[PDB]
Every structure is written in C-alpha cells, then in structure tokens.
Structure 1
Amino acid sequence: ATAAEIAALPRQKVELVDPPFVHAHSQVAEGGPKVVEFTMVIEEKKIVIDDAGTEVHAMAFNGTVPGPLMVVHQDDYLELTLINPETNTLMHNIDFHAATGALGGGGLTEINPGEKTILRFKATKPGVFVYHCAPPGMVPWHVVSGGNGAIMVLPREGLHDGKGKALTYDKIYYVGEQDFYVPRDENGKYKKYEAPGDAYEDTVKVMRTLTPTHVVFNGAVGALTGDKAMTAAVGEKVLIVHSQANRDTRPHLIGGHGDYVWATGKFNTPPDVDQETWFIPGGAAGAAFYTFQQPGIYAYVNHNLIEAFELGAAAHFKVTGEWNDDLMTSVLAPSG
C-alpha cells in the first residue's frame, strides 16, 4: 500500500488489559485492514516475586510483567505509542518479532526518560510473537528484568486446524513466563537495591551461570494460583498463549492436553495434536487450544518440574461442571 492508501484506512483505538486476560477482539476480522492503535507507558518499579520478599527492578510495559497481549489481524497495521516517563532512569525501546525492519522496531524506538515515540508496522505474518526491550549493549538485562510481552496476529478468517475446519475459542488467556536472576550475598540471602543501575554488575554475574534463581508466570510465584486461578467450565474451548523472551519452556496442562498446539506459534504452520507437553524456545511464543472435559483443579506448568515446583513456574485452572466417569473413575479409592 501507498502512504495515501494507509492514511485512508479506518483507525481503531484499543484499550489494553492486564495479563493473563486479553483485550476485546474478534477472532474473524470485522472488515478490511485497519490501523489498530495501542499505547503503553513503561514503568520502572520494584516487584516482589516470591514469599521471601525477593525484589526485582522490573521494566514493566504498561505496568505489568509480562506486558499485555496486543491482538490484530494479518495485514492490519499496529501503531504503538510508547512512552518513557521522566520518573524512569533508563533508556528503553521495543522490538516486535512480528515486524520487519530496523531490528523489529528497536532501532526506531530508543526513548530516554521524558520521551515518546510512535511506531507503525504491517502485521504481514499470522501467529503469536514475542516483543521485548532491546537497548544496544544492555539487551539481556532489560529482557530478564521483565521487559517483554507478546502479540497475536490472527488470520483474517480466524483460527483453523490442519484440514481447514474452523477452531473457535470461548476463552483466551496469556501466560508470560519469566526467568529472573537475582543476586545473593555470602549467606545465600537475596540482595535488595535502591536503584535499577545498582544491581547491574551483580546481575550480569548471575546471568552468566545460565541458571535462573526464579522461573515464574505473570511476574511472581503464585501469581496465577489461589484466587488468581484462570477459569473455565466443562465443554469450553480455551486458547492459552505462552511466551518466553529469553529461555526455553515446556508447557503442560496437568490433567489435560493441548488438543491443538501451534508450538512454533505460527498459524501457517499446521498445529501439532493430542500434545502432553509442548516446547517453546527462548525468544518465541506458542499457543495451545483445549476443550475441557473434566471439572476440578488443573495445574499448568513448565514441565521441568524443578522449574515448576521449586522455582515458581506453576499456574492453576479452576473448572466447573459434571465429572465424567467414562473418561476417569476411581474404581477403588485409597484404602488398606
């Protein structure tokens, strides 16, 4: 399209919501190509990531870790207004894996505190894609401080399975998984700092071990459990988008499956089916589609079970409905 043709396209302002929820959208596109507009203020803030009061100096797109899911359709334009407030201490930017050119946008969005920028790109490829901060020379530090999220570029005709039959979800959730590298002192206690820059040297040493101290969903241990469990009902079709900007993960729904899984995250690559545990490499997003068949509590984990149950990578689903004894029954309950 020409500059004039794009200027004539309809504009739609989207209001982002905090993960794991996803802003309102249509699966099948409602009309022709649009310029879909998003705004995000980058907030540098302390976050507490475990029950020992361990702190991270986060880079929080839109005030969350992960940053929110942005949803467009293929051949829409995504126009982001990105704002770095004067209260921040560092330069930041954004690299959309979904975009083409200038290091994903990173080369065009370097904004110091007190500045803002507007980037527009054409979402030419359908899929879920990571986005993340990437300041030259400081890239991994910003990403593992929580400066990452994802977007979903739906096909204009919605999702389909490998034979072209429609796949339509009732619910969608976004799980951002984060590897943290928190320095400790001589007695094994996690260190606290009063400024992001103060922890840099110490953090780089931990990162070089390639061994995260914490691996969490939605910014902290237990962030998606207890009261913040995701919900569904028997019969409901659910899409779980999962991202990891820096490090591999292997998602698994304990008690369920991935009926369809775009493990590469790309919708023109047909989905795998009947999956127990799928694999998303660092620097990517994937998506799984599941129809719940049984009520009760499910745990959704990175199935390196040390990472899930020692380091923090575990979420819950609470599911309502009728139990199915054909699928599963206790013939003899635990007894002497």
Structure 2
Amino acid sequence: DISTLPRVKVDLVKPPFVHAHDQVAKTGPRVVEFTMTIEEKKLVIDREGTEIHAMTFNGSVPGPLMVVHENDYVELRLINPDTNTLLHNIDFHAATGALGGGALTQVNPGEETTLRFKATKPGVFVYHCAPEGMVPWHVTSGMNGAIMVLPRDGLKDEKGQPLTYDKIYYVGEQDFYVPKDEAGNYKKYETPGEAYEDAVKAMRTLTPTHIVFNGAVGALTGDHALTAAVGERVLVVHSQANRDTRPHLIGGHGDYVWATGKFRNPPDLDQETWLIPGGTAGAAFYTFRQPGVYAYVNHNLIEAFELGAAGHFKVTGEWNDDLMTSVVKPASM
C-alpha cells in the first residue's frame, strides 16, 4: 500500500518563512519526506549580549514549519551529529502513539533514525524534543517547532466558503529562563551540561527572564519586519510549546482565528486578542486595509515590551481616510 504511494522530498526553510506548498491538494495522498539535523549552539538572545546554549532543530529557534495535507504520511529522517553532546528525540502533537514518536526517536550524538506517521487530523500542531527526565530543559532551550496539516480542500470560513491566503508566516514564541547570580546578572556557561543544575532552579521560579519571537529580542524588527501590502490576505501561524500567550496585531484584528489551531472547528471572527495555551499552535487570518507599521505582540505588555515578545509588520499601499483620519492634528489647546 504505502509502497505504491508517490513520494516527494521537501527542503525546509528558516522561520518566519515557510516552504513552498499547495493550499488545495492537487494530487492524492503521498509520503512527504523531510530531513532535520539537530544543532546544539550558542545564541545571544538580547542587546546586552546575553548568551545561552540553544538546542535546535535545523539550526533555528523555532525549528522549521512542516506543511502537509490531511492523510499524507510524514516520513522524517532525524540526525543527531557526533558534534552534539546530548541525547535528543522528537514528539509530534500531530501524531498518534508512542508519545508522539518520542519513544521511537531517541538518538545519541552520532546516530540517526527515520519515523513515519499518518497525519490523520487537520490543523497546526506543536512538535518538540522530549527526552525522559529532561523534557522541560530541552523545550525551554528552544527545541520545538510546528507542523501544519491542511485539509485536502484548503481553509474555509464559518459558512464553509474558501479562505485563500497570499502570504504565510510562522512566528515561534519562546520563553527562556537564564540563571542569574545574586545581583541579578545572567550567568554564562561553557557547555550545555555545565548549565543543567542552574537551569532547573531557574525554571522552577516559573518566571521567564526573556520571552522572544524567532529566537531573539528584536528578531522580527527593523530590516527583519514581516511584509505585506494593502489587500493581501495573510495567515500567521503562532506556537508556544510551554507557556500561554495572547497574540494581538496592533492596528489590526484577527478576521478569522483558530486559537487552538484545529481546522475542523469553525474559526472565531473579529478577534482583538486570542489565547493560545502553552503546548499549542494557533493560526490567524487577516486582510490588510491600511498601510504603515503594525506591531505584532503577546498582549501581556510587560512580556511584550520589557521581555522581548514583540515584532513588526510593514505594509505598503494607500491610506484610507474613511477607516481612520486625524481630524485635528496634535496642537496647543
């Protein structure tokens, strides 16, 4: 049976970008093959040069977004090179059985493995590393990403009418818990193992030191802001593998939102802000109507503006005065 199915190999791209795919399936079920290489590496996460030992899927935080269709088979080749120091594995919330695949994918440095699973449910799901005994440490070190399982006939609104996006971006939100000394300065370590004991004490406080989008404070700002034009329909997939978040587009809305990200449910309309529970991926669809800069944020404003959970969208086009206008510009009373 599977033997007889067609197979296509797909090369992943770095977040916030997403690999090429079809919204409405043009072929029947296939075996979609992906390859990911584990990379343990130092990462500076803020302006002051704070550095951590990140554990990544393909060298990025978050790991890349995989896109398949309902009932395709996902075949993943997972490689843990001998240059790494720790055992890793992968748990797909999209999969059924063996702890999401975690029990079947344990690889020490120098090993690789190939897992296959059937994508039976449509929606966006979180995938993350989960080794017995050190699950939170690997997850909060950036070892998580997401997979989107699109219905074979694409996305639909509450009335069952088609929703087609022109652009899609993947925003992975990460809560970090950097160990601190007595005065409050962040500690630095030579290897991941040296950090272990302190990491556990830092996590138990339940208070992140940093909460960032795309691995670093300001990662999606300035020259890295997300782009769009007035009239374009944009799908924003957002994931948080360990902690709740409440996304919000400043100056815009979520026209259609699947906060818990499962496509067989009708979306919520006109959301100002929505809650994505820790351990979940969600998606929001919006059509831009005004040009300018928009701030995309976690709406606990302390987490957004003090801790790092803020990004930008720069949109081009003509301003619509009917929607909004400054009647009297700021001036002396």
Q: Compute the TM-score of the two structures, normalised by the length of structure 1.
A: 0.98
- Find out whether 1:193 has 2:189 as its counterpart: yes
Gaps of 5+ in 2: none
Partner of 1:183: 179
SS of structure 2 residue aligned to 1:151 = strand
- Structure 1 runs (4+) deviating above 6 angstroms are none
CA RMSD after TM alignment: 0.4
Q: State the distance in 2 between where 1:293 and 1:7 align.
A: 48
Measured after TM superposition, the shift of residue 288 of structure 1 is: 0.1
Q: State the distance in 1 between where 2:47 and 2:180 align.
A: 16
In the TM superposition, 1:236-247 aligns within 5 A as 236-247=232-243
**Residue identity matched to 1:94:** I
SS of structure 2 residue aligned to 1:141 = helix
What is the aligned-residue identity percentage? 82
- Find out whether 1:274 has 2:270 as its counterpart: yes
Partner of 2:254: 258
- Find out whether 1:15 has 2:14 as its counterpart: no
**Residue identity matched to 2:113:** T
Partner of 1:316: 312
Partner of 2:80: 84
- Find out whether 1:41 has 2:57 as its counterpart: no
Residues 156-200 of structure 1: per-residue CA shift (max 9 Å, x gap): 000001111000000000000000000011221111100001111
- Find out whether 1:30 has 2:31 as its counterpart: no
**Residue identity matched to 1:283:** G
Residues 197-238 of structure 1: per-residue CA shift (max 9 Å, x gap): 111111111110110000000000000011000000000000
Partner of 2:119: 123
SS of structure 2 residue aligned to 1:173 = strand
SS of structure 1 residue aligned to 2:147 = strand
In the TM superposition, 1:156-305 aligns within 5 A as 156-305=152-301
**Residue identity matched to 2:301:** L
SS of structure 1 residue aligned to 2:196 = helix
Measured after TM superposition, the shift of residue 273 of structure 1 is: 0.4
Q: State the distance in 2 between where 1:163 and 1:6 align.
A: 35
Q: 1:6 aligns with which of 2, 5, 12?
A: 2
Partner of 1:106: 102
**Residue identity matched to 2:107:** I
Q: State the distance in 1 between where 2:118 and 2:85 align.
A: 31
Partner of 1:136: 132
SS of structure 1 residue aligned to 2:5 = coil
**Residue identity matched to 1:194:** E
Q: State the distance in 1 between where 2:42 and 2:286 align.
A: 35
Measured after TM superposition, the shift of residue 47 of structure 1 is: 0.5
Q: State the distance in 2 between where 1:187 and 1:278 align.
A: 37
Range moving further from structure 2, 201-210 or 106-115: 201-210
SS of structure 1 residue aligned to 2:313 = strand
Q: 2:57 aligns with which of 61, 65, 87?
A: 61
SS of structure 2 residue aligned to 1:7 = helix
Q: State the distance in 1 between where 2:92 and 2:329 align.
A: 52
Residues 80-136 of structure 1: per-residue CA shift (max 9 Å, x gap): 100000000000000000000000000000000000000000000000000000000
Q: 1:327 aligns with which of 295, 318, 323?
A: 323
Gaps of 5+ in 1: none
Q: State the distance in 2 between where 1:198 and 1:80 align.
A: 31
Partner of 1:72: 68
Q: State the distance in 2 between where 1:292 and 1:163 align.
A: 22
Q: State the distance in 2 between where 1:101 and 1:149 align.
A: 19
Measured after TM superposition, the shift of residue 55 of structure 1 is: 1.1
Measured after TM superposition, the shift of residue 79 of structure 1 is: 0.5
**Residue identity matched to 2:216:** A
SS of structure 1 residue aligned to 2:219 = coil
Q: State the distance in 2 between where 1:30 and 1:47 align.
A: 40
